[PDB]
Amino acid sequence: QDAYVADVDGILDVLRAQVLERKPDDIFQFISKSALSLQKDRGAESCDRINCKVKDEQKSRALTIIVFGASGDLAKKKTFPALFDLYCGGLLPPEVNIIGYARTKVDDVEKWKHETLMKYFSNLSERGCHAEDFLKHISYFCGAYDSVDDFKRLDAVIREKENAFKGPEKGGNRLFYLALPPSVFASVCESIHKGAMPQEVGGWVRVIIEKPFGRDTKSSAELSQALEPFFDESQLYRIDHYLGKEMVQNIITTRFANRIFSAVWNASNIACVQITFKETIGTEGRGGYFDNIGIIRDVMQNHLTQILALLAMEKPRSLDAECIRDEKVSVLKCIEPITKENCVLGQYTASADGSIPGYLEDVTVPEGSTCPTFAVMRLNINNDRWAGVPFILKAGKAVEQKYVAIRIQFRDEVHPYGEATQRNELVIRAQPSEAMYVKITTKVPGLSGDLRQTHQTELDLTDAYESLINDALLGNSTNFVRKDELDVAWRIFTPLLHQIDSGEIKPIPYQAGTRGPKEADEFIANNGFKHQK
Amino acid sequence: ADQDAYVADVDGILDVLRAQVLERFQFISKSALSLQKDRVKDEQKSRALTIIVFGASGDLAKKKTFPALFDLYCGGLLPPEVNIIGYARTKVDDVEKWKHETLMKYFSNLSERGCHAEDFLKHISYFCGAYDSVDDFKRLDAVIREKENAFKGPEKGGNRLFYLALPPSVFASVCESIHKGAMPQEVGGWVRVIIEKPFGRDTKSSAELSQALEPFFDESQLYRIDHYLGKEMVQNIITTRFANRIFSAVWNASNIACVQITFKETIGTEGRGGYFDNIGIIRDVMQNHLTQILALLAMEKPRSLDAECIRDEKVSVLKCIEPITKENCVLGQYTASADGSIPGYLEDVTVPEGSTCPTFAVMRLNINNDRWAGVPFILKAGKAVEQKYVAIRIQFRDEVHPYGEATQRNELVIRAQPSEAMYVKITTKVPGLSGDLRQTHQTELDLTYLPDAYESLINDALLGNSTNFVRKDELDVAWRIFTPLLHQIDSGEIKPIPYQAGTRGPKEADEFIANNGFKHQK
Ligand SMILES: O=P(O)(O)OC[C@H]1O[C@@H](O)[C@H](O)[C@@H](O)[C@@H]1O
């Protein structure tokens, strides 16, 4: 009896959240349709069948997935659970070999997999009863990241499994995951180049790189130069959290598969472009790690710029991965480096109710830090398509809501309807929930009147990490940052980053839970952005 | 009044019960138990208002005109002292009974509106006269002037709205009779005349009739009604097209590849083939309604939101059309359905033997102006087809690069009946696996969110806007598009293709549509 009340109460709060994000102006009809979407979301789940949707090419050669730092935090929370989810869906070959590689000694190996790895398997994956069947593919290798001799032994271990493959293709494909700090990558790749390359008889090698790719142009070019003598770009897969989201991948399709959007994607129709990233959480007591990164290096240099490239890129000659990336780097060469006056920075303080402590109230943050936890800036693309178009990138910690979306405003509708209408908007939201809607003006369906009584109406339309790993198995480099793409990305931000490190610009304080500095919203308004709400 | 208050309710209840019972009693018992559980601007009140419905004894007035007037009062859109006068040819010595047994019978939703029905009929009076007697219109004017002077308001006089629910052969006499006997008082008041039935059958026939009414009423007083010009989605065409930059920038020949305006009905002529045989499907709906839609689609941006500014642009684009010719038209005539439920058109006894009247017609129009040059506009209408469907389908040119056969052409659909809908068909990638991104699917982008069209038309007439009313110049330019073709049809140069009822029509129709820039992918 006591258990009944919790479920009905837990459901309505989810129902309340949905009717507040979609904002349907016919209140009654939406809740009925939205409610039926989540009824099948929790129920109707069984553990009877595992349909492997793998291509005939994937089962031809043995596959080996090596996760370096398997005892680490990133491997246990995200890397291994995603491999489990991929396996649950039947996306791994039946004879996949997974090897955990770490420095740490582990006795009672099976206890560790069940007590450490299985512990972080998610409740949403808990409807999997074949977890024991999945762990059968996992083995543990204790070695150092600097020993070519250990890699020769690892190679003997992988070769044992590779030669035991019951398929036509010989050799074996090897996907290496570096769930490690960036200071180790050059050492592991040198060691992998000398000790654990794929067999000469057949098999490719691919390396996934996770942690930040430097902190400036020089740091990244030094790091990219360390790996060039070992791996080309068809082998290096620089991963990104957002590129795997379906709505971000769909931007290429919504823009270029449709003439309606194609014809207005220029300066002659587009008036203001905004790419916003909002989080409710602060630094959560680990502000010391963030003090050396800043909000710009964290999410604006890599993720938001990755988004901005997909919006402004020219038409690729084809849908091939590197053809798409070429246009991605080419538009990133049409940008001007961000300047000091085109940037407004912020740093969050304690909340009004005191629930969220300030950034400087953290003991791990150095005293007198000018590290930004908020930044809004305008970029300029100098080409025939985007000349004069404002591109606003915004990122902020401990703000009024967690919200990640694109909001494009089209050119002001030149007076056939006057003030009765406003600017058209195209919205692409990826977080908290996927949604893509267009805001246009229609007449109010009550009476004809003067036809000046109109209303703004929206035209709605409804895991990332694991899909990206699969693209790596599938060899889809479309959603991975390229070397030239990374260096030209860095050249946009480094002059400003150097000015930030020398103290030329300092963040404006703002209480947690607000939108941020008052000057930021003014700066956005001063750069072609207007709203009527 | 301890007896009249009981009797008035008892009379109001039973008169509602009679209207509803159409089938072969026990229903009156069920309805009583259902009814047992059932528990304006200052300018509008400045002058008296008088609504005259000519031809009240006709089918159109009793079924459609007066029931719609009831809805205007239910919505609270009529002034509290409005005076409605029913004018008809036949004398009926059933003064109060006729209002309850004939007019109320066709009122809708009598299970909630039967308590304001008695207050509505109190505004209705009946005048029996001839449509040709200046003396009678003098007597009618003397009845109206008494109520006008009995108005408790600052402004004197009164406004008079005349409705001609009559065949067109009676219009010239009634407008002449109004001009000599029942014009508004010299102290104040406007006059407006609503005209419904077809305005001739060609350019000349329409021209003779338009010349007949000019010596009696100008264009600010003549409100030529059109059923669809008041439709919510058709009225919305002007807003969605110009209030939004997204649509404005693609509304030309550079982005648009084919436009289709389709009107589909499942019923045949329903044993009334004799009346339709002399009209044809082109004059019935294609010359007036579909072209009224077509005018709103191809009009340029009006200089303002003023009514005549919009109608000027409505006329200006209809003058850029070339008259439809014989090779750009496929006609059809329906035969008995495959299920036998719908008898053939020639199976009607009221239809002449060997008749070539079209029950189906698709034709292409060419608009020669900068915005639409080369854009095919297909107008299609058909009786006794696979479904009742009335919509606009604009197909844009798909840029193949860089998606090729993985994408198709974007579509804009605006449906007004049977159900309101405005959606865009685009291709997005399938939200499954990333794969090659060539795995896409065509997804439609639907629009999310008193009512009836006829009622709104009357109000716009009461408000005096005239945006949604056919203009004199607009009518002449509309006919000159269709008249050369109708003459070739009336001379037998083109003959309809037989097709069984329930199908899409003749197979040659779909070929003609396919041969003019329109593609399907299913
Ligand atoms: O005018 P019709 O074709 O007889 O049908 C009723 C129509 O009347 C209109 O005025 C209504 O808005 C529509 O709901 C409907 O399409």
Author numbering:
A (entry chain A): 10 to 471, 482 to 552
B (entry chain B): 8 to 31, 37 to 51, 63 to 472, 480 to 552
Quoted passage from the original study:
The housekeeping enzyme glucose 6-phosphate dehydrogenase (G6PD) (EC 1.1.1.49) is the first and rate-limiting enzyme of the PPP.
Within the G6P binding pocket, this conformational change was mainly visible through Y251 and surrounding residues (H250-Y254). Significantly larger conformational changes than in the structures complexed with NADP(H) are observed after binding substrate G6P. Moreover, the angle between the “Rossmann-like” domain and the β + α domain is reduced when G6P is bound. Structural comparison of the monomers shows that regions I248–I260 (α9) and P481–F499 (α14) rearrange, with the main chain atoms shifting by about 1.5 Å and the Y251 side chain by about 3 Å. Furthermore, residues H250, K254, M256 (α9), H312 (α12), and Y484 (α14) adopt different side-chain conformations. Remarkably in all structures, G6P is bound only in subunit B of the G6PD dimer, although subunits A and B are essentially similar (RMSD ~ 0.7 Å). However, in G6P-bound LdG6PD structures, the position of G6P that best explains the electron density is different from that of homologous G6PD structures. Compared to these structures, the G6P conformation is rotated by 180° and located in a cleft, formed by amino acids D482-A483, Q440, H250-Y251, and K254.
